[PDB]
What does this fold into?
Amino acid sequence: AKHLFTSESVSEGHPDKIADQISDAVLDAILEQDPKARVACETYVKTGMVLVGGEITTSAWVDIEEITRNTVREIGYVHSDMGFDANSCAVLSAIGK
Amino acid sequence: AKHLFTSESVSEGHPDKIADQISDAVLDAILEQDPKARVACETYVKTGMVLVGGEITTSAWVDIEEITRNTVREIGYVHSDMGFDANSCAVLSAIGK
Amino acid sequence: AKHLFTSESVSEGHPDKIADQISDAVLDAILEQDPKARVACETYVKTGMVLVGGEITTSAWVDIEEITRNTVREIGYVHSDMGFDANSCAVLSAIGK
It folds into this structure.
């Protein structure tokens, strides 16, 4: 047989993966505080705005924006020229607990 | 000096005072948890979205949108036809500790 | 050769497909105005708010708000107790032209 098969991955630097990283980092810290919790959080990423919202039932106490900025920093978007920075980007916590 | 002096007032029902109630209800809640927090929270009221943001220095922990929906319900915007419903409206928290 | 298979669908009434509806309705609007345009719009949908944002290159002139409200209304979420209203939902266009 002769056939060509293709796949494609992204860096963490790509937006979508940024979104997922943010969401699950939130999930990680939360579930750490309480394993029993229930969390469904989605993250929109725009030019400079990071939006985070979803349904959470738990007794945990977590800052959304804190984990947000820390994650972005770990990725490395820290400067205007990169097009983004945790120090710059505004965080919108839309989660209702 | 015969002359007319005018002054106006808005009900609690009014958008602006709605925002103020939101803000200072948040502030009372936090200050209750922490007498010595430093709080500067700003509240925005669009049609279906109430936004809150600002910078709070403390160790407290408060479910913002909870306080918001509570305050609204207390005021009584409890239905669509009312033009606004607590259980309906999205709450956008932008506060950063 | 005996196996059970499964498939899954959602009415348009489902929120996700609602979001997709919104995006594509915007798309049809623009395309109607101009064919050649480049459009990449995404739509987040919270309880009371629909956020719409994307990269758009065109000579078009299109209100996001009117389109979104029309689409949602056509779907029927026209009441609070429904869980969502077309008239009182918050419309946010993050669109950059």
About this structure: Chain C touches chain B through 16 residues (CB under 8 Å). Helices of chain C lie at 15-33, 64-75. The first helix of chain C runs from residue 15 to 33. Residues 15-97 of chain C form a domain with the GMP Synthetase; Chain A, domain 3 fold (CATH 3.30.300.10).
